[PDB]
Ligand binder design. Structure first.
Ligand SMILES: Nc1ncnc2c1ncn2[C@@H]1O[C@H](COP(=O)(O)OP(=O)(O)OP(=O)(O)O)[C@@H](O)[C@H]1O
Ligand SMILES: [Zn+2]
Lengths: 416, 427
């Protein structure tokens, strides 16, 4: 039925222009900050990855939407920004602005994290209230010409279990049933599936300076935007950290609703980051006892602190060997790698974050009422007896240690 | 009202309608200054079903039971038709960018499209606003709204999340359980689309809504029915995801307060004159009359002592919290408890010059942020922020509550809760 195919195509195009598909939550559903996909993150940096060995320079949208291949996989890390890219593609098709997507008659944006039963059920309940004129199981029979006309965008693969909907796994695995275009978003844990298909692999990189500036100016009152964009010129640490989305949407979120600009200090930016990181997942964290959760985080703390003294930032799987590795990974404190160039190992969000983490742990030891913890705290400070090292290797650690506590500061200054 | 014939250009009059008289001479004789008289001296199955529904709706909205919208709780009599000349201050805020612009009603009615929302503090007048819109449409003397063929004013106050539209409109808008069926209503909605407007009041949550209505919010692209939803700022986190911009109600302007008092009274000019002077010199106290509900509080007092030529500046607060007990009351353990806990918060805040509170400051005061009474005293702000905050209605009110709490502490016979009054007094 051409009449139904035309209405379906029109409904998809209009759906992707509605606010319900554009109003995005950059921090979480708990914190009521809403960004419009039309004005926010617009210019992603993608790399074409070959066998983990990077290989080639950046592939931008439109270009990557022309150089399409059999089913492709796009991957993030441990959870930085969110999968806004797939939504952006659907938007571009719906507007018709980009000719790269003009050849497509249908584009379906799906969330695999909220899918079950089958394809028709998922599309009907998740995307559009598709009528019984289409849902006769005759749709695919006539659609079959879709090989070069239909694009499926699948988010949250890492949140989807194949038993929930065998059709999804069967199609994403085989694909040749429709021979259509498929783009699916995954995480590093999904490297276990990526290398099994031979699929083109797209890596999401960092932000450009212009992108970070654009967000500051677009979603922050002028007076505060002008202040923040000056502070970023004075501090080299911010210029590097601002390349990562979670340090862009936070460094401005803390000033939303304010009337005056404050520099804050880059100890509270990490504190805010840390607190949110261990709270946004507090529901899924229920899989671990609250006391065990604390122990896991304390372990991570000690690892970071030892790492600073040992001059190491890369932790091998066996270095962590804490059992509650899943807890730290669920939290997002560590990023897991299983790549050939990254045999099972963990890294911190950022080098300076590991230093923050170490600082937070050292201060919590020093301020503990238990003499064993205090002794350990002093044991770490005791090693710092060298002006040339204090002003270098341990400078960052001491700054975070003091920033987190007055009592920790007392211990530090008496030593120094 | 039985035999009251009112003049649109000067107010209620001609009580008991003198029999056999001539309205032109009676009007002139009684009010020989009325501008009107001065000017006078100088000079297709669903289609037919939809039509029948339209006529019934119009009759319901122009009837003298929808008009006289209990403004200021004057009475069931004493016509208040001439008091419907004051509007609210409306601004449009973007949900994303920090952008705000002022509006007037002629520029609001022309921008009604898909899903829109009106936000404000308790008592801001959002319920009167929605009724006024339905009234203008039914009258038909307001081009710009005349494009709508069906307008439904509904209150989602207790409606179960399984009731169909026919079962709702037949209860709240129509006289009897007839005229329409569920299939008739659905067939009409999908045919008129843009020409159907719902005014949904008393919105609480997305879950506790008729399924048939929830589907017009969540997926409003397969219908394009226009919805206008009124909420308190204590919520308004549930529907922001479906909006582009929000209409926000701002403080009710002092000049509207003056006009209302001038029209209702004027029999005691020596009291009204003092009112004008008082708020002339005390420029910041003009903020007391922020919410129309406070204006009602004054009127209620001024009708009890109509000939007492004095202005008591605290009378509005004593009245406001008295009428509070006549809304949805529970004197024992609720009204007393909410006032006491809020009073403690205010008392502490007024000696640190806070006038703004966070969630921990609120929690220690024993105030339940989800209670219904603690919304007529205080408002919550959850706007685009990393963390929410709370603020009392116009600050002069906070001082009043702080004063009230201090007295309770001093009078109480509990040493543990009495010496505290001295602690605060000695500040
Ligand atoms: N234009 C006006 N002129 C005079 N009084 C008004 C006007 N508009 C509103 N009011 C007063 O506002 C009160 C209703 O306030 P509001 O519309 O905010 O409802 P509410 O008290 O918040 O409760 P709900 O939202 O459940 O209706 C009425 O008692 C009315 O007296
Ligand atoms: Zn007159």
């Amino acid at each position: 039925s051409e009449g139904d195919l035309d209405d379906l195509a029109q409904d998809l195009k209009d759906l992707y222009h509605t606010p319900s598909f554009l109003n995005f939550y950059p921090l979480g559903e708990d914190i009521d900050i809403i960004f419009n996909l039309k004005s926010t993150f617009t210019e992603p940096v993608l790399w074409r990855k070959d066998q983990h060995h990077h290989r080639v320079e950046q592939l931008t949208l439109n270009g990557l939407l022309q150089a399409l291949q059999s089913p492709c996989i796009i991957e993030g890390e441990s959870g930085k920004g969110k999968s806004t890219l797939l939504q952006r593609i659907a938007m571009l098709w719906g507007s018709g602005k980009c000719k790269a997507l003009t050849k497509f008659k249908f584009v379906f944006f799906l969330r695999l994290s909220r899918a079950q039963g089958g394809l028709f059920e998922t599309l009907c309940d998740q995307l559009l209230d598709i009528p019984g004129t289409i849902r006769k199981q005759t749709f695919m029979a006539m659609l079959l010409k879709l090989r070069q006309r239909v694009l499926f965008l699948l988010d949250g693969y890492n949140e989807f279990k194949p038993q929930n909907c065998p059709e999804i796994e069967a199609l994403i695995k085989e694909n040749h049933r429709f021979k259509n275009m498929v783009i699916v978003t995954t995480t590093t844990e999904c490297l276990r599936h990526i290398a099994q298909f031979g699929a083109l692999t797209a890596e999401v990189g960092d932000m450009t300076e212009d992108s970070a500036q654009a967000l500051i100016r677009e979603v922050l009152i002028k007076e505060l935007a002008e202040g923040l964009l000056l502070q970023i010129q004075k501090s080299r640490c911010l210029r590097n950290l601002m390349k990562t989305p979670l340090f862009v949407v936070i460094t401005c979120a803390i000033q939303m609703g304010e009337s005056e600009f404050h520099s804050h200090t880059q100890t509270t930016l990490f504190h805010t980051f840390y607190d949110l990181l261990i709270q946004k997942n507090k529901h899924k964290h229920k899989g671990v006892a609250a006391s065990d959760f604390i122990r896991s985080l304390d372990h991570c703390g000690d690892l970071a602190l030892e790492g600073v003294f040992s001059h190491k930032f890369d932790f091998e799987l066996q270095d962590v060997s804490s059992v509650n590795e899943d807890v730290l990974l669920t939290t997002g404190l560590l990023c897991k790698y299983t790549a050939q160039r990254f045999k099972p190992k963990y890294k911190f969000f950022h080098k300076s974050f590991q230093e923050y983490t170490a600082g937070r742990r050292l201060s919590s030891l020093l301020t503990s009422h238990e003499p064993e913890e205090v002794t350990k705290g002093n044991g770490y400070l005791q090693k710092m007896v060298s002006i040339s090292d204090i002003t270098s290797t341990y400078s960052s650690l001491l700054r975070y240690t003091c920033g987190s506590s007055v009592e920790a500061t007392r211990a530090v200054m008496k030593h120094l | 009202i039985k035999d009251i014939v009112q003049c649109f250009s000067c107010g209620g009059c001609l009580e008991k309608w003198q029999e056999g008289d001539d309205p032109l001479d009676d009007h002139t004789r009684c009010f020989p200054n009325c501008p009107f008289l001065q000017n006078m001296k100088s000079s297709a199955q669903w289609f037919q079903e939809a039509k029948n529904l339209n006529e019934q709706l119009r009759a319901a909205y122009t009837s003298a039971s929808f008009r006289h919208m209990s403004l200021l709780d004057i009475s069931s009599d004493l016509a208040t038709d001439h008091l419907l000349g004051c509007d609210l201050s409306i601004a449009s805020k973007h949900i994303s960018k920090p952008v705000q612009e002022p509006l007037v009603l002629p520029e609001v009615f022309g921008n009604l499209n898909s899903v829109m929302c009106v936000e404000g503090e308790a008592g801001s007048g959002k319920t009167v606003l929605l009724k006024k819109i339905a009234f203008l449409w039914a009258s038909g003397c307001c081009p710009l709204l005349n494009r709508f063929q069906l307008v439904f004013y509904l209150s989602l106050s207790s409606t179960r999340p399984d009731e169909g539209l026919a079962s709702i409109i037949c209860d709240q808008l129509l006289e009897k359980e007839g005229s329409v069926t569920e299939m008739c209503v659905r067939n009409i909605i999908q045919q008129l689309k843009n020409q159907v407007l719902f005014l949904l009041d008393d919105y609480k949550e997305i879950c506790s809504i008729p399924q048939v209505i929830g589907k017009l919010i969540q997926k409003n692209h397969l219908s394009r029915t226009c919805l206008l939803i009124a909420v308190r700022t204590n919520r308004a986190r549930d529907i922001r995801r479906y909006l582009e911009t929000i209409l926000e109600i701002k403080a009710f302007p002092f000049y509207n307060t003056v006009c209302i008092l001038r029209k209702l009274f004027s029999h005691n000019m020596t009291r009204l004159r003092k009112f004008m002077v008082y708020f002339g010199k005390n420029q910041s106290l003009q903020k007391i009359q922020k919410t129309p509900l406070f204006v009602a509080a004054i009127c209620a007092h001024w009708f009890q002592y109509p000939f007492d030529p004095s202005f008591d500046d605290v009378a509005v607060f004593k009245s406001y919290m008295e009428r509070l007990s006549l809304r949805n009351k529970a004197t024992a353990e609720i009204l007393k408890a909410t006032v006491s806990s809020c009073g403690e918060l205010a008392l502490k805040g007024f000696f640190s010059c806070c006038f703004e509170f966070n969630d921990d400051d609120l929690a220690e005061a024993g105030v339940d942020e989800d209670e219904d009474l603690t919304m007529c005293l205080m408002s919550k702000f959850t706007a685009q922020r990393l963390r929410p905050f709370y603020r009392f209605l116009s600050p002069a009110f906070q001082e009043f509550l702080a004063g009230m709490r201090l007295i309770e502490l001093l009078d109480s016979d509990r040493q543990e809760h009495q010496d505290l009054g001295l602690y605060h007094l000695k500040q």
